[PDB]
Design an enzyme around this catalytic site. Structure first.
Site, PDB file in Angstrom:
ATOM      1  N   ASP A 164     -24.125 -30.184 -44.729  1.00 50.64           N
ATOM      2  CA  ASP A 164     -25.990 -30.015 -45.792  1.00 50.64           C
ATOM      3  C   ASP A 164     -26.605 -29.410 -44.981  1.00 50.64           C
ATOM      4  OD1 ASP A 164     -27.819 -31.952 -43.303  1.00 50.64           O
ATOM      5  OD2 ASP A 164     -26.186 -32.132 -43.448  1.00 50.64           O
ATOM      6  N   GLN A 189     -30.281 -24.330 -51.759  1.00 55.82           N
ATOM      7  CA  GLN A 189     -31.216 -24.130 -50.690  1.00 55.82           C
ATOM      8  C   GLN A 189     -31.727 -24.125 -49.586  1.00 55.82           C
ATOM      9  OE1 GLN A 189     -33.362 -27.125 -51.415  1.00 55.82           O
ATOM     10  NE2 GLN A 189     -33.790 -26.838 -49.800  1.00 55.82           N
ATOM     11  N   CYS A 216     -22.907 -32.590 -54.683  1.00 54.63           N
ATOM     12  CA  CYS A 216     -23.304 -32.450 -53.361  1.00 54.63           C
ATOM     13  C   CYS A 216     -23.858 -33.925 -53.173  1.00 54.63           C
ATOM     14  CB  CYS A 216     -23.755 -31.376 -52.699  1.00 54.63           C
ATOM     15  SG  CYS A 216     -25.293 -30.815 -53.987  1.00 54.63           S
ATOM     16  N   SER A 217     -24.967 -33.894 -52.862  1.00 55.81           N
ATOM     17  CA  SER A 217     -25.992 -35.298 -52.681  1.00 55.81           C
ATOM     18  C   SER A 217     -26.963 -34.756 -53.694  1.00 55.81           C
ATOM     19  CB  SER A 217     -26.664 -35.328 -51.163  1.00 55.81           C
ATOM     20  OG  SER A 217     -27.133 -36.627 -51.243  1.00 55.81           O
ATOM     21  N   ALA A 218     -27.785 -33.708 -53.770  1.00 55.33           N
ATOM     22  CA  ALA A 218     -29.311 -33.544 -54.479  1.00 55.33           C
ATOM     23  C   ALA A 218     -28.550 -32.990 -55.486  1.00 55.33           C
ATOM     24  CB  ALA A 218     -30.028 -32.899 -54.105  1.00 55.33           C
ATOM     25  N   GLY A 219     -27.117 -32.354 -55.845  1.00 54.12           N
ATOM     26  CA  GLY A 219     -26.757 -31.520 -56.112  1.00 54.12           C
ATOM     27  C   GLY A 219     -27.803 -29.742 -57.010  1.00 54.12           C
ATOM     28  N   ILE A 220     -28.041 -29.949 -56.030  1.00 57.56           N
ATOM     29  CA  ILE A 220     -28.912 -28.369 -56.033  1.00 57.56           C
ATOM     30  C   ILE A 220     -28.501 -27.662 -54.548  1.00 57.56           C
ATOM     31  CG2 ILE A 220     -30.373 -29.679 -57.525  1.00 57.56           C
ATOM     32  CD1 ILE A 220     -32.189 -29.113 -54.667  1.00 57.56           C
ATOM     33  N   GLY A 221     -27.711 -27.403 -53.864  1.00 53.53           N
ATOM     34  CA  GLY A 221     -27.988 -26.633 -52.962  1.00 53.53           C
ATOM     35  C   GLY A 221     -26.480 -26.405 -52.129  1.00 53.53           C
ATOM     36  N   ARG A 222     -25.745 -27.301 -51.682  1.00 49.67           N
ATOM     37  CA  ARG A 222     -24.129 -26.969 -51.860  1.00 49.67           C
ATOM     38  C   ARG A 222     -23.574 -26.536 -53.556  1.00 49.67           C
ATOM     39  NH1 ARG A 222     -22.988 -31.090 -47.580  1.00 49.67           N
ATOM     40  NH2 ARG A 222     -24.642 -32.027 -48.638  1.00 49.67           N
ATOM     41  N   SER A 223     -24.300 -27.517 -53.363  1.00 48.65           N
ATOM     42  CA  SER A 223     -23.564 -27.632 -56.023  1.00 48.65           C
ATOM     43  C   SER A 223     -23.950 -26.435 -56.599  1.00 48.65           C
ATOM     44  CB  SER A 223     -23.918 -28.181 -56.477  1.00 48.65           C
ATOM     45  OG  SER A 223     -23.773 -29.413 -56.212  1.00 48.65           O
TER      46      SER A 223
HETATM   47  O1  LIG Z   1     -27.013 -29.479 -50.782  1.00 51.58           O
HETATM   48  C1  LIG Z   1     -28.098 -28.830 -49.430  1.00 51.58           C
HETATM   49  O2  LIG Z   1     -27.503 -27.892 -49.094  1.00 51.58           O
HETATM   50  C2  LIG Z   1     -29.325 -30.021 -49.432  1.00 51.58           C
HETATM   51  O3  LIG Z   1     -29.010 -30.651 -50.457  1.00 51.58           O
HETATM   52  C3  LIG Z   1     -30.280 -31.730 -50.546  1.00 51.58           C
HETATM   53  C4  LIG Z   1     -30.336 -32.541 -49.259  1.00 51.58           C
HETATM   54  C5  LIG Z   1     -29.194 -33.571 -48.662  1.00 51.58           C
HETATM   55  O4  LIG Z   1     -27.595 -33.119 -48.255  1.00 51.58           O
HETATM   56  O5  LIG Z   1     -29.700 -34.615 -48.169  1.00 51.58           O
HETATM   57  S1  LIG Z   1     -31.656 -33.710 -49.283  1.00 51.58           S
HETATM   58  C6  LIG Z   1     -32.022 -32.750 -50.581  1.00 51.58           C
HETATM   59  C7  LIG Z   1     -33.640 -32.463 -51.105  1.00 51.58           C
HETATM   60  C8  LIG Z   1     -34.051 -33.537 -51.400  1.00 51.58           C
HETATM   61  C9  LIG Z   1     -35.357 -34.086 -51.697  1.00 51.58           C
HETATM   62  C10 LIG Z   1     -36.471 -32.553 -52.048  1.00 51.58           C
HETATM   63  C11 LIG Z   1     -35.917 -31.455 -50.759  1.00 51.58           C
HETATM   64  N1  LIG Z   1     -36.991 -30.528 -51.402  1.00 51.58           N
HETATM   65  C12 LIG Z   1     -37.207 -29.456 -49.958  1.00 51.58           C
HETATM   66  O6  LIG Z   1     -37.395 -28.402 -50.519  1.00 51.58           O
HETATM   67  C13 LIG Z   1     -36.543 -30.499 -48.691  1.00 51.58           C
HETATM   68  C14 LIG Z   1     -35.771 -30.094 -47.928  1.00 51.58           C
HETATM   69  C15 LIG Z   1     -35.715 -30.145 -46.734  1.00 51.58           C
HETATM   70  C16 LIG Z   1     -36.849 -31.572 -46.615  1.00 51.58           C
HETATM   71  C17 LIG Z   1     -36.989 -32.057 -47.894  1.00 51.58           C
HETATM   72  C18 LIG Z   1     -36.981 -31.527 -48.694  1.00 51.58           C
HETATM   73  C19 LIG Z   1     -36.760 -29.158 -52.681  1.00 51.58           C
HETATM   74  C20 LIG Z   1     -38.414 -30.258 -53.442  1.00 51.58           C
HETATM   75  C21 LIG Z   1     -37.844 -29.275 -54.932  1.00 51.58           C
HETATM   76  C22 LIG Z   1     -36.993 -29.100 -55.345  1.00 51.58           C
HETATM   77  C23 LIG Z   1     -35.896 -28.739 -55.045  1.00 51.58           C
HETATM   78  C24 LIG Z   1     -35.345 -29.289 -53.445  1.00 51.58           C
HETATM   79  C25 LIG Z   1     -35.190 -31.355 -50.892  1.00 51.58           C
HETATM   80  C26 LIG Z   1     -31.198 -31.383 -50.524  1.00 51.58           C
HETATM   81 BR1  LIG Z   1     -31.356 -30.166 -51.568  1.00 51.58          BR
END
Ligand SMILES: O=C(O)COc1c(C(=O)O)sc(-c2cccc(N(C(=O)c3ccccc3)C3CCCCC3)c2)c1Br
Length: 297
Positions: free
Chosen positions: A180, A261, A214-221
């Protein structure tokens, strides 16, 4: 041109700035349906929602909402559905979506537990003899077989619409070692996995869009999809120089917020595309090289 640009960004150490520029320019659309009070418990993360215009609608009169977006890449002529890791109450919805959208493949880029937290519900059966029934959406899911490698597992699933008794084979591609907020071990190990998905036929336009989560469906995805689309664009034109990666990412971000991300995930996307370009342009030998370097066995 991607490779020259890559070296210039590295040399000047400006990946953070290049990445933040993408955040700054990225599309902003409403997510009003996702934000309705009745949908609060259908969202894993408060701040990660599908835009209304590109959200996947479930074909039910009750509540059609699922946290999932159709990333429709017009020029590339490939579509992906990006979605969050299903929750304990949305696994039925998740499989309803797979059924209705006629998807053949599901790509999972996370583990169920990461850093001590549950990032995803256990939405597929882990044992042949313990099939899952989703009563709310009238679907049955059975593990048919699985092929476990050192860092990823491929599963064959049978999805049955209990209403029609129609069954389909779903391929599940589970990358288990992608941290992550992190990047794959190497371009080789990433590309080896991407090519497994490609070789399955799961990305064919004859099927519905592959589901990627993935978990949020944006970063790794987002990283997985950016690399795949860039390689596909380059492939259709047989012209690696014609591909503008940041432009492609910005196009994708029209359909779902936050795709990719971190700056290093962006940097990694360049690495994978640059390396993948070798295969696209006729060096078929690199594929077995990736396999070896990936340490599958
Ligand atoms: O797949 C990955 O590499 C990471 O994936 C993720 C998570 C996990 O696997 O636990 S949690 C997560 C996430 C969840 C809520 C908000 C956000 N966003 C952040 O900028 C952020 C980043 C780190 C911590 C808190 C917030 C923003 C909020 C605005 C919209 C874009 C993300 C990110 C992502 Br993304």
């Amino acid at each position: 041109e991607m490779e020259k640009e890559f070296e210039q960004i590295d040399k000047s150490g400006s990946w953070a700035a290049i990445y933040q520029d993408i955040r700054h320019e990225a599309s902003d659309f409403p997510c009003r349906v996702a934000k309705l009070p009745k949908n609060k418990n259908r969202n894993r993360y408060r701040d990660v929602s599908p835009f209304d215009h590109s959200r996947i609608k479930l074909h039910q009169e009750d509540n059609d909402y699922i946290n999932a977006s159709l990333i429709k890449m017009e020029e590339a002529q490939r579509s992906y559905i990006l979605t969050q890791g299903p929750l304990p109450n949305t696994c039925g919805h998740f499989w309803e979506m797979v059924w209705e959208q006629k998807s053949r493949g599901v790509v999972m880029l996370n583990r169920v537990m990461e850093k001590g937290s549950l990032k995803c519900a256990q939405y597929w059966p882990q044992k042949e003899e313990k099939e899952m029934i989703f009563e709310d959406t009238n679907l049955k899911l059975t593990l048919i077989s699985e092929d476990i490698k050192s860092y990823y597992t491929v599963r064959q699933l049978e999805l049955e619409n209990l209403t029609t008794q129609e069954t389909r084979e779903i391929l599940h591609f589970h990358y288990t070692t992608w941290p992550d907020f992190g990047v794959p071990e190497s371009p080789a190990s990433f590309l080896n996995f991407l090519f497994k998905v490609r070789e399955s036929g799961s990305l064919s336009p004859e099927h519905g869009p592959v589901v990627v989560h993935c978990s949020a469906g944006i970063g790794r995805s987002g990283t997985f999809c950016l690399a795949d689309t860039c390689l596909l664009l380059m492939d259709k034109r047989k012209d690696p120089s014609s591909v503008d990666i940041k432009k492609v990412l910005l196009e994708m971000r029209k359909f779902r917020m936050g795709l990719i991300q971190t700056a290093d995930q962006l940097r990694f996307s360049y690495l994978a595309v640059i390396e993948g370009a070798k295969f696209i342009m006729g060096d078929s030998s690199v594929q077995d090289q990736w396999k070896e370097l990936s340490h599958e066995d």
